[PDB]
Coordinates of C-alpha atoms in Angstrom, one line a residue:
Chain K
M256 CA 0.2 32.3 -11.5
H257 CA -1.0 30.7 -13.8
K258 CA -4.7 28.6 -14.5
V259 CA -5.1 25.1 -16.0
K260 CA -7.1 23.9 -18.5
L261 CA -8.4 20.2 -19.4
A262 CA -8.0 20.6 -23.0
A263 CA -9.6 17.8 -25.1
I264 CA -8.9 14.2 -23.9
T265 CA -9.3 10.9 -26.5
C266 CA -9.5 6.9 -25.6
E267 CA -8.3 4.0 -27.7
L268 CA -9.7 0.2 -27.5
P269 CA -8.7 -2.8 -28.2
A270 CA -10.7 -4.0 -31.4
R271 CA -11.7 -7.1 -29.9
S272 CA -14.8 -7.5 -27.3
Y273 CA -14.7 -10.8 -24.8
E274 CA -17.7 -12.2 -23.2
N275 CA -17.1 -13.5 -19.1
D276 CA -18.1 -16.4 -21.3
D277 CA -15.5 -16.8 -23.9
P278 CA -13.7 -19.8 -23.9
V279 CA -10.4 -18.2 -23.0
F280 CA -11.9 -18.2 -19.5
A281 CA -11.8 -22.5 -19.8
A282 CA -9.1 -22.4 -16.8
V283 CA -10.9 -20.2 -14.3
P284 CA -12.6 -22.1 -11.7
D285 CA -15.4 -21.0 -9.2
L286 CA -16.5 -18.9 -11.5
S287 CA -20.3 -17.8 -10.2
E288 CA -22.9 -16.0 -11.7
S289 CA -23.0 -13.9 -7.8
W290 CA -18.6 -13.0 -9.3
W291 CA -19.5 -11.5 -11.8
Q292 CA -21.9 -9.0 -10.5
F293 CA -19.6 -8.7 -7.4
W294 CA -16.9 -6.9 -9.8
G295 CA -19.8 -6.0 -12.5
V296 CA -17.4 -6.9 -15.6
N297 CA -19.6 -8.5 -18.5
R298 CA -16.8 -8.1 -21.3
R299 CA -13.5 -6.5 -21.6
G300 CA -10.9 -6.1 -24.8
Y301 CA -7.6 -7.8 -25.1
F302 CA -4.8 -5.9 -27.5
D303 CA -4.1 -8.5 -30.1
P304 CA -0.2 -7.9 -31.1
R305 CA -1.2 -9.5 -34.3
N306 CA -3.0 -7.3 -35.6
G307 CA -1.1 -4.1 -34.7
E308 CA -2.3 -3.0 -32.1
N309 CA 0.2 -2.8 -28.7
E310 CA 0.3 0.1 -25.6
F311 CA 1.7 2.3 -28.4
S312 CA 0.5 1.8 -31.6
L313 CA -2.9 2.4 -29.9
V314 CA -1.2 5.7 -28.1
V315 CA 0.1 7.0 -31.7
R316 CA -3.5 6.7 -33.3
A317 CA -4.9 8.3 -30.3
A318 CA -2.2 11.2 -30.1
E319 CA -2.6 12.2 -33.5
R320 CA -5.8 12.0 -33.5
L321 CA -6.1 14.0 -30.7
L322 CA -3.2 16.8 -32.2
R323 CA -4.8 16.6 -35.3
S324 CA -8.6 17.6 -33.6
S325 CA -7.7 19.9 -30.8
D326 CA -5.6 22.3 -33.8
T327 CA -2.0 21.5 -31.9
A328 CA 1.2 21.7 -34.1
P329 CA 3.7 18.5 -32.5
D330 CA 6.3 21.4 -32.4
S331 CA 3.5 23.7 -30.1
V332 CA 3.8 20.7 -26.7
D333 CA 6.4 22.0 -24.0
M334 CA 6.1 18.4 -22.5
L335 CA 5.1 14.5 -22.5
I336 CA 4.0 12.6 -19.7
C337 CA 3.4 8.9 -19.7
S338 CA 2.2 6.1 -17.8
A339 CA 1.7 2.5 -18.6
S340 CA 1.7 0.1 -15.2
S341 CA 3.2 -3.1 -17.0
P342 CA 6.9 -2.9 -16.8
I343 CA 6.9 -4.6 -20.3
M344 CA 6.9 -2.6 -23.2
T345 CA 7.1 -4.1 -26.8
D346 CA 6.9 -1.5 -29.9
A347 CA 9.0 1.7 -30.5
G348 CA 7.2 2.5 -34.2
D349 CA 9.6 4.0 -36.1
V350 CA 12.1 5.4 -33.9
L351 CA 14.1 1.8 -33.0
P352 CA 12.0 -0.4 -35.4
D353 CA 13.5 -3.4 -34.5
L354 CA 13.4 -3.7 -31.0
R355 CA 10.3 -5.3 -29.7
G356 CA 10.2 -7.1 -26.1
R357 CA 11.9 -4.2 -23.7
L358 CA 11.9 -3.1 -20.2
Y359 CA 14.0 -0.5 -21.9
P360 CA 13.3 2.7 -22.4
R361 CA 9.4 3.3 -21.2
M362 CA 7.4 5.2 -23.8
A363 CA 8.0 8.9 -23.6
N364 CA 11.1 9.4 -25.3
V365 CA 10.3 7.3 -28.5
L366 CA 7.0 8.9 -28.8
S367 CA 7.7 12.2 -28.4
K368 CA 10.3 11.4 -32.0
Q369 CA 7.5 9.3 -33.2
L370 CA 4.9 12.4 -33.2
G371 CA 7.9 15.3 -33.4
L372 CA 7.4 16.7 -30.4
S373 CA 10.3 18.5 -31.3
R374 CA 10.3 20.7 -28.7
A375 CA 8.5 18.4 -25.8
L376 CA 10.0 16.9 -22.3
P377 CA 10.1 13.2 -22.1
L378 CA 8.9 11.9 -18.5
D379 CA 7.4 8.7 -17.7
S380 CA 5.9 8.1 -14.8
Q381 CA 4.2 5.1 -11.9
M382 CA 2.2 5.4 -9.7
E383 CA -0.6 2.2 -11.2
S384 CA -3.9 3.1 -11.1
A385 CA -3.4 6.4 -9.8
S386 CA -1.1 8.0 -12.7
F387 CA -3.6 10.1 -14.1
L388 CA -4.4 11.4 -11.1
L389 CA -0.1 12.3 -11.4
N390 CA 0.2 13.0 -14.2
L391 CA -2.4 15.9 -14.4
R392 CA -0.8 17.0 -11.5
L393 CA 2.7 17.0 -12.8
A394 CA 1.2 18.8 -15.6
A395 CA -0.7 21.3 -13.7
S396 CA 2.0 22.5 -11.4
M397 CA 3.8 22.6 -14.4
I398 CA 1.4 25.2 -15.6
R399 CA 0.7 26.9 -12.6
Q400 CA 4.4 27.7 -12.5
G401 CA 4.4 29.2 -15.9
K402 CA 7.4 26.4 -17.2
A403 CA 4.5 24.8 -20.0
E404 CA 2.2 25.7 -21.9
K405 CA 1.1 22.5 -23.4
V406 CA 1.4 19.0 -21.9
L407 CA 0.4 15.5 -23.2
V408 CA 0.0 13.2 -20.7
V409 CA -0.6 9.4 -21.9
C410 CA -1.8 6.4 -19.8
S411 CA -1.7 3.2 -22.0
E412 CA -2.8 0.3 -20.7
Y413 CA -1.6 -3.4 -22.1
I414 CA -1.9 -6.4 -19.4
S415 CA -3.2 -8.8 -20.8
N416 CA -0.1 -10.4 -22.1
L417 CA 0.2 -11.0 -18.4
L418 CA -2.9 -11.9 -16.8
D419 CA -2.8 -15.7 -16.0
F420 CA -5.8 -17.4 -17.5
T421 CA -6.3 -20.0 -15.0
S422 CA -6.9 -17.7 -12.6
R423 CA -10.0 -16.2 -11.8
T424 CA -7.8 -12.7 -11.5
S425 CA -7.5 -12.4 -15.7
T426 CA -11.2 -11.9 -15.7
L427 CA -10.8 -8.4 -14.3
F428 CA -8.3 -6.4 -16.2
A429 CA -8.5 -5.1 -19.6
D430 CA -6.2 -3.6 -21.6
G431 CA -6.8 0.2 -23.1
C432 CA -5.0 3.7 -23.4
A433 CA -6.3 6.9 -22.9
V434 CA -5.0 11.3 -24.2
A435 CA -5.1 14.3 -23.2
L436 CA -3.7 17.8 -23.6
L437 CA -3.9 20.4 -21.1
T438 CA -3.1 24.3 -22.0
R439 CA -2.0 27.0 -20.1
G440 CA -5.8 28.5 -19.7
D441 CA -5.8 32.4 -17.9
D442 CA -8.2 34.0 -20.2
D443 CA -10.6 30.7 -20.1
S444 CA -12.7 30.1 -16.6
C445 CA -11.0 26.2 -17.0
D446 CA -8.5 25.4 -14.0
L447 CA -7.3 23.0 -11.7
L448 CA -9.0 24.1 -8.2
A449 CA -7.8 21.6 -5.9
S450 CA -5.4 18.2 -4.9
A451 CA -5.2 15.9 -1.8
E452 CA -3.6 12.7 -1.0
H453 CA -4.0 10.9 1.6
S454 CA -2.4 7.9 3.1
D455 CA -3.5 5.4 6.4
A456 CA -3.7 -5.1 -0.9
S457 CA -6.6 -2.0 0.5
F458 CA -10.2 -2.1 -0.1
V459 CA -11.1 0.1 3.2
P460 CA -14.1 3.1 1.4
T461 CA -13.0 5.5 3.9
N462 CA -9.4 6.0 2.8
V463 CA -10.7 7.8 -0.7
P464 CA -13.4 9.7 1.0
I465 CA -10.7 11.3 3.2
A466 CA -8.6 12.3 0.2
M467 CA -11.4 13.7 -1.6
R468 CA -12.6 16.0 1.8
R469 CA -9.0 17.6 2.1
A470 CA -9.5 18.0 -1.8
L471 CA -12.8 20.0 -1.0
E472 CA -11.9 22.0 2.2
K473 CA -8.3 23.0 0.4
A474 CA -10.6 24.6 -2.5
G475 CA -13.5 25.7 0.2
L476 CA -16.1 23.6 -1.0
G477 CA -18.5 21.1 -0.4
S478 CA -20.1 18.1 -1.8
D479 CA -23.0 20.3 -2.8
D480 CA -21.3 22.3 -4.6
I481 CA -20.0 19.6 -7.2
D482 CA -21.5 19.0 -9.8
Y483 CA -20.7 15.6 -10.7
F484 CA -18.2 12.9 -9.7
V485 CA -15.3 10.0 -11.9
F486 CA -13.9 7.5 -9.7
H487 CA -11.7 4.6 -10.7
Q488 CA -13.8 1.3 -11.4
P489 CA -12.3 -1.2 -9.3
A490 CA -15.9 -2.4 -8.5
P491 CA -19.5 -1.1 -8.0
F492 CA -19.9 -1.8 -4.0
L493 CA -15.9 0.4 -3.8
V494 CA -18.0 3.9 -6.5
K495 CA -20.9 3.4 -4.1
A496 CA -19.1 3.0 -0.6
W497 CA -16.7 6.0 -1.6
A498 CA -19.7 8.2 -3.6
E499 CA -21.6 7.4 -0.4
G500 CA -18.8 8.4 2.0
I501 CA -18.5 11.8 0.4
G502 CA -22.2 12.5 -0.3
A503 CA -22.4 11.8 -3.9
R504 CA -25.6 11.0 -4.9
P505 CA -25.7 8.1 -8.6
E506 CA -27.0 10.6 -10.0
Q507 CA -23.3 12.0 -9.7
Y508 CA -21.1 9.1 -11.4
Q509 CA -20.7 6.5 -13.8
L510 CA -19.9 2.9 -13.6
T511 CA -18.0 2.1 -16.5
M512 CA -15.9 -1.0 -16.1
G513 CA -18.9 -3.5 -17.4
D514 CA -17.8 -2.5 -20.9
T515 CA -13.7 -2.5 -20.7
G516 CA -12.8 -3.7 -17.3
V517 CA -10.8 -2.7 -14.8
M518 CA -8.4 -0.8 -16.6
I519 CA -5.6 -0.2 -13.9
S520 CA -4.8 3.6 -14.6
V521 CA -6.9 4.6 -18.1
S522 CA -10.5 3.5 -16.0
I523 CA -10.4 7.2 -14.2
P524 CA -9.8 8.9 -17.7
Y525 CA -12.1 6.1 -19.7
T526 CA -15.2 7.4 -16.8
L527 CA -14.6 11.1 -17.6
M528 CA -14.7 11.2 -21.3
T529 CA -17.7 8.7 -21.1
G530 CA -19.8 11.6 -18.9
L531 CA -18.6 14.2 -21.5
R532 CA -19.2 12.4 -24.2
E533 CA -23.4 11.6 -23.0
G534 CA -23.5 15.0 -22.1
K535 CA -23.2 14.0 -18.0
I536 CA -20.3 16.4 -17.5
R537 CA -21.3 19.9 -19.3
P538 CA -19.3 23.0 -19.7
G539 CA -18.9 25.2 -16.8
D540 CA -19.3 22.2 -14.3
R541 CA -16.8 21.5 -11.5
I542 CA -16.1 18.3 -11.2
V543 CA -13.4 15.6 -8.7
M544 CA -12.0 12.9 -9.8
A545 CA -10.8 10.4 -7.5
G546 CA -8.8 7.0 -7.2
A547 CA -6.1 4.7 -4.7
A548 CA -2.7 3.5 -6.3
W549 CA -0.7 1.9 -1.9
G550 CA -1.5 6.5 -2.2
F551 CA -4.9 8.0 -2.5
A552 CA -5.6 10.8 -4.5
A553 CA -8.4 13.2 -5.3
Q554 CA -8.9 16.5 -7.7
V555 CA -11.3 19.0 -7.9
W556 CA -11.5 20.5 -11.7
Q557 CA -13.5 23.0 -12.7
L558 CA -14.0 22.2 -16.5
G559 CA -14.6 24.9 -19.3
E560 CA -15.1 23.3 -22.5
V561 CA -13.5 20.0 -23.1
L562 CA -12.8 18.4 -26.9
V563 CA -13.8 14.9 -26.8
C564 CA -12.3 13.3 -30.2
Chain P
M287 CA 15.2 22.6 -4.5
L288 CA 17.4 23.3 -1.7
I289 CA 20.0 19.4 -1.0
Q290 CA 19.4 19.2 3.1
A291 CA 21.5 16.5 3.0
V292 CA 22.8 13.1 0.4
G293 CA 23.0 9.1 1.7
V294 CA 25.2 7.0 -0.3
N295 CA 25.6 3.2 0.3
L296 CA 27.4 1.5 -2.4
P297 CA 29.1 -2.1 -2.7
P298 CA 32.2 -2.2 -2.2
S299 CA 33.1 -4.9 -4.6
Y300 CA 34.2 -4.1 -7.7
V301 CA 33.9 -5.8 -11.3
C302 CA 36.1 -4.7 -14.1
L303 CA 34.9 -4.3 -17.9
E304 CA 36.7 -3.8 -20.8
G305 CA 35.9 -2.2 -24.0
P306 CA 35.5 0.9 -25.3
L307 CA 32.3 2.3 -23.4
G308 CA 34.3 -0.1 -19.7
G309 CA 35.3 0.8 -17.3
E310 CA 35.1 -0.6 -13.3
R311 CA 31.7 0.0 -11.4
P312 CA 30.3 -1.7 -7.9
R313 CA 28.3 -4.8 -8.6
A314 CA 26.1 -6.3 -6.3
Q315 CA 26.6 -9.7 -5.5
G316 CA 24.8 -13.0 -4.7
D317 CA 21.3 -13.1 -3.7
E318 CA 22.4 -8.7 -2.1
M319 CA 18.9 -6.6 -2.9
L320 CA 19.4 -3.0 -3.1
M321 CA 17.3 -2.4 0.1
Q322 CA 20.0 -3.4 2.1
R323 CA 22.2 -0.8 1.2
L324 CA 18.7 1.9 -0.2
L325 CA 18.0 2.3 4.3
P326 CA 21.0 2.7 5.8
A327 CA 21.3 5.1 2.6
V328 CA 18.6 7.4 3.4
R329 CA 19.0 6.8 7.5
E330 CA 22.5 8.5 6.9
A331 CA 20.6 11.2 5.0
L332 CA 17.4 11.8 7.6
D333 CA 19.9 12.1 10.2
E334 CA 22.2 14.6 8.6
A335 CA 19.5 16.6 8.5
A336 CA 17.9 15.7 11.9
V337 CA 14.0 14.6 10.1
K338 CA 12.0 12.4 11.1
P339 CA 10.3 9.7 8.7
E340 CA 7.3 10.5 10.0
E341 CA 8.1 13.8 8.5
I342 CA 8.6 12.6 5.0
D343 CA 6.0 14.0 2.6
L344 CA 7.2 12.8 -0.7
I345 CA 9.1 9.7 -2.0
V346 CA 10.2 9.5 -5.7
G347 CA 12.4 6.2 -6.7
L348 CA 15.1 5.9 -9.9
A349 CA 15.9 2.2 -10.3
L350 CA 16.1 0.3 -13.5
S351 CA 17.3 -2.8 -12.5
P352 CA 14.2 -5.0 -12.3
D353 CA 14.9 -7.8 -9.6
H354 CA 16.3 -7.5 -6.8
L355 CA 15.4 -4.8 -5.4
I356 CA 13.1 -6.4 -1.9
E357 CA 12.9 -9.6 -0.1
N358 CA 9.6 -9.7 -2.2
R359 CA 10.4 -11.8 -6.1
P360 CA 8.2 -3.8 -8.2
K361 CA 8.6 0.4 -8.0
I362 CA 11.4 1.0 -5.4
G363 CA 9.4 4.2 -3.4
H364 CA 6.6 2.3 -1.7
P365 CA 8.5 -0.5 0.2
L366 CA 11.1 1.8 1.4
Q367 CA 8.1 3.3 2.4
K368 CA 7.0 0.6 4.3
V369 CA 10.2 0.2 6.3
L370 CA 11.3 3.9 7.0
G371 CA 7.9 4.3 8.8
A372 CA 6.5 7.7 6.3
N373 CA 3.6 7.0 6.6
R374 CA 2.6 10.2 5.6
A375 CA 5.0 10.0 2.9
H376 CA 3.4 10.0 -0.5
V377 CA 5.1 8.3 -3.8
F378 CA 5.3 7.4 -7.3
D379 CA 8.2 6.1 -9.3
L380 CA 9.6 8.2 -12.6
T381 CA 11.5 4.8 -14.2
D382 CA 13.9 6.2 -16.7
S383 CA 14.4 9.5 -16.2
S384 CA 17.4 11.5 -15.3
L385 CA 18.1 12.5 -11.8
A386 CA 18.9 15.9 -13.0
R387 CA 15.1 16.1 -14.5
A388 CA 13.6 14.1 -11.5
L389 CA 14.3 17.0 -9.4
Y390 CA 13.1 19.8 -12.0
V391 CA 10.2 18.2 -12.0
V392 CA 10.1 16.9 -8.3
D393 CA 10.4 20.9 -7.1
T394 CA 8.0 22.3 -9.7
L395 CA 5.6 19.8 -8.4
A396 CA 6.6 19.6 -4.3
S397 CA 7.0 23.6 -4.5
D398 CA 3.1 24.4 -5.5
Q399 CA 1.7 21.1 -2.7
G400 CA 3.4 23.0 -0.5
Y401 CA 5.7 20.1 1.0
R402 CA 9.1 20.6 2.9
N403 CA 10.3 17.4 3.0
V404 CA 11.3 15.3 0.0
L405 CA 13.2 12.2 -0.7
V406 CA 14.4 11.3 -4.2
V407 CA 16.2 8.4 -4.2
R408 CA 18.3 6.9 -7.2
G409 CA 19.5 2.3 -6.7
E410 CA 20.4 -0.3 -9.0
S411 CA 21.0 -3.7 -8.0
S412 CA 21.9 -5.6 -11.2
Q413 CA 22.5 -9.1 -10.9
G414 CA 18.6 -9.0 -12.7
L415 CA 21.2 -8.2 -15.7
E416 CA 23.8 -9.0 -18.1
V417 CA 26.1 -6.5 -19.2
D418 CA 26.8 -5.5 -22.9
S419 CA 30.0 -7.6 -23.5
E420 CA 30.8 -6.0 -27.1
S421 CA 31.3 -2.3 -25.5
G422 CA 31.7 -3.0 -22.2
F423 CA 29.2 -0.6 -21.1
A424 CA 27.1 -2.1 -17.9
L425 CA 25.5 0.1 -14.9
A426 CA 27.0 0.9 -11.3
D427 CA 25.0 -0.2 -8.7
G428 CA 24.6 1.6 -5.0
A429 CA 21.8 3.9 -3.2
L430 CA 21.4 7.5 -4.1
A431 CA 19.3 9.1 -0.8
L432 CA 18.6 13.5 -1.5
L433 CA 16.8 14.5 1.0
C434 CA 15.6 17.6 -0.1
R435 CA 13.2 20.9 0.0
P436 CA 11.4 22.9 -2.8
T437 CA 12.0 25.4 -4.1
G438 CA 10.7 25.6 -7.7
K439 CA 13.4 28.2 -8.6
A440 CA 15.2 25.3 -10.4
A441 CA 16.7 26.3 -13.5
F442 CA 16.3 23.3 -16.0
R443 CA 18.1 22.7 -19.8
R444 CA 18.4 19.6 -21.8
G445 CA 21.0 19.5 -24.2
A446 CA 22.4 17.6 -26.8
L447 CA 25.9 15.7 -26.8
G448 CA 29.3 16.8 -28.3
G449 CA 31.6 15.0 -31.2
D450 CA 30.6 15.1 -35.2
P451 CA 26.7 16.9 -35.1
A452 CA 25.4 14.8 -37.6
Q453 CA 26.6 11.5 -36.2
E454 CA 23.4 9.7 -34.9
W455 CA 24.2 8.4 -31.0
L456 CA 23.1 4.8 -30.8
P457 CA 20.9 4.7 -28.0
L458 CA 20.8 2.5 -24.7
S459 CA 18.2 -0.4 -24.5
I460 CA 17.6 -3.1 -22.5
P461 CA 15.4 -5.6 -24.2
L462 CA 13.6 -8.4 -22.4
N463 CA 14.8 -11.9 -22.2
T464 CA 12.5 -14.0 -24.1
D465 CA 13.9 -17.6 -22.8
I466 CA 13.5 -17.3 -19.2
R467 CA 13.4 -20.9 -17.8
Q468 CA 14.5 -21.3 -14.4
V469 CA 14.9 -19.1 -10.9
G470 CA 18.4 -16.7 -11.5
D471 CA 18.3 -16.0 -15.3
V472 CA 18.6 -12.7 -15.5
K473 CA 15.2 -10.1 -16.6
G474 CA 16.5 -7.9 -19.5
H475 CA 19.9 -7.6 -21.2
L476 CA 21.6 -3.7 -21.7
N477 CA 22.2 -3.3 -25.3
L478 CA 24.4 0.3 -25.6
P479 CA 26.1 -0.2 -28.8
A480 CA 30.5 -0.1 -28.6
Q481 CA 30.9 4.1 -29.9
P482 CA 34.8 5.1 -28.3
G483 CA 34.1 8.6 -28.6
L484 CA 30.8 8.7 -26.8
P485 CA 32.6 9.3 -23.3
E486 CA 33.9 12.2 -24.3
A487 CA 31.0 13.3 -26.2
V488 CA 28.6 13.7 -22.5
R489 CA 31.6 15.5 -21.5
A490 CA 31.6 17.6 -24.2
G491 CA 27.8 17.9 -23.7
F492 CA 28.2 18.9 -19.3
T493 CA 30.4 21.7 -21.3
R494 CA 28.1 23.4 -23.4
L495 CA 25.0 22.6 -21.3
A496 CA 26.3 24.2 -18.8
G497 CA 26.9 27.3 -20.8
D498 CA 23.1 27.6 -21.0
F499 CA 23.1 29.2 -17.0
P500 CA 24.9 31.6 -14.6
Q501 CA 29.1 30.1 -13.8
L502 CA 28.5 27.6 -11.2
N503 CA 30.0 25.0 -9.4
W504 CA 29.1 21.3 -10.9
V505 CA 27.8 18.1 -9.4
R506 CA 28.4 15.6 -12.4
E507 CA 27.7 12.2 -13.8
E508 CA 30.8 9.3 -14.7
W509 CA 29.3 6.6 -16.3
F510 CA 32.3 5.5 -18.3
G511 CA 36.3 4.3 -16.7
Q512 CA 37.4 6.1 -19.9
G513 CA 40.3 9.1 -19.2
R514 CA 39.1 8.1 -15.6
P515 CA 41.7 7.2 -12.9
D516 CA 42.3 2.9 -12.9
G517 CA 38.9 2.8 -15.4
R518 CA 37.2 3.4 -12.0
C519 CA 33.3 5.2 -12.2
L520 CA 30.3 5.6 -10.4
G521 CA 27.5 6.5 -12.8
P522 CA 25.1 8.5 -10.7
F523 CA 26.5 8.1 -7.7
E524 CA 29.6 10.0 -8.3
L525 CA 27.9 13.3 -7.2
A526 CA 27.6 12.0 -3.6
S527 CA 32.0 12.6 -2.6
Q528 CA 30.5 15.9 -5.1
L529 CA 27.9 17.2 -3.6
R530 CA 29.6 17.0 -0.2
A531 CA 33.3 17.9 -0.6
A532 CA 30.0 21.1 -1.6
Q533 CA 29.2 21.3 2.3
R534 CA 32.4 21.5 3.4
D535 CA 33.2 24.5 0.9
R536 CA 30.2 26.2 2.4
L537 CA 29.0 26.2 -1.2
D538 CA 25.3 27.6 -1.5
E539 CA 24.6 26.3 -5.0
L540 CA 25.3 24.7 -7.4
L541 CA 24.3 22.9 -11.3
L542 CA 23.7 19.3 -11.1
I543 CA 24.0 17.4 -14.2
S544 CA 22.6 14.2 -16.0
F545 CA 23.6 11.7 -18.6
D546 CA 20.6 10.2 -20.0
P547 CA 21.7 6.8 -21.7
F548 CA 18.2 6.5 -23.3
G549 CA 18.2 9.8 -24.8
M550 CA 21.7 10.6 -25.4
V551 CA 21.3 13.2 -24.2
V552 CA 22.9 16.1 -21.1
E553 CA 20.3 17.3 -18.3
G554 CA 21.1 19.9 -15.9
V555 CA 19.3 21.2 -12.8
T556 CA 20.5 24.4 -10.5
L557 CA 20.4 23.0 -6.8
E558 CA 20.7 25.3 -3.3
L559 CA 23.0 23.4 -0.5
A560 CA 22.4 23.5 2.8
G561 CA 25.8 23.8 4.7

């Protein structure tokens, strides 16, 4: 009924980065050169709450920057969908100024009031590393069926305060946030062509290609018809296995965990932004975004001009 | 959104709390886990509709309880899929959303994806949450299972509470327990300030909101015991008995109205009901 336009996207990373030899990893045993090559991480960022960095403060900065750059009035936002892998949130801005560590509420209701989204329906979803894809699909359905004209999507990862820095797992994940705006695009070329999810903790390289294959099949396209690919960033060898599994060449996707780490639900949107800002992805390109939760999801997008801010 | 069948399973133990927001509500005991009640509630709904777990296209969960969900010391949608055998089902969670809002969003997504058998579940096992002893607010425990068929024509509205329009109702929050030292400690605390006019304000919101829709029979939630017989209320789980009473009356359409204590609003969604 309506076409879905991915209008703008932005990210906000922590100001402080940590090297693989940073003293914070002094208690981590059995680290090796092969370990860093295996996971492909060289440096990572952790929020510093003492300086005001948390899952909320940086989303406000990114959301306010995106709305200002995209010339979007706050009252014109019809829906706000937020995701956060951490069950703990820590800041509610001026809405609930006295509330600190909390299990509930989540972010959407508080964030909409902080930004003045007086007409926006708030929603908080959880699908782990696939949360960004889930939120884009929810937004797409609302826009497709004429139930919304502007949808603001948020993913915010503040996991560093839960990491056990006596374990090697603490060297893999990092903090970050991403904000994106989807709008009705009947007159423009951008639209969501198709999406797919498949089921079969799970490292099997084939499960993501299966989802990608179904999405292309639903859209009536093949891998050759796709211009660029955007994957989740669990490890270089998995991303490569996904690419080869679907026929994508090394020149048709990026590996971005090197400077950010594995940002769970933010790695995908961050990778999409990087490809756009670096000229890798350009107007008119048809791209595939794929990742895994236990679920696996893929989406085929016909992109127009996307505002990176 | 068509309601194919409804399953419900509540603990038999009721716990009474005094205060303006108090009442007598079901409460899980000891080391009871949510899945012990959610699973039979789901199986009940699947049997009524004659739907196999392999036929479930989507599972969406709603649960505030931070623990006592499954044996493994976590969202509810995935462990349910494992025990059901819904190997073809997709899973995600909508956290602190109301049921009405979740049914609207799911109805939009699922109809747009072409799914035919969607499972929306609501559950609580709040042993890990300290009640608000000042106001008497507590969550009702139990499990609700809604087996749905999406249509995309469900209407939705979000309305304010009643009472003085200049009055700012103080919302529910669940602060984290900052001193968790040993096994058995709560993970959080229920915080909903004592507001004696709030239970009536919510019911006044229901009435005002229903004006935004055609004149439909209701299935509504009751989170507070004030003015209720014996002070007993089942929170969102009140919907079960009302939905089955609507099926006996051969009703084809209904309005489901939820109360969201986090946003301090009421939310309604229109639904169809199978015979």
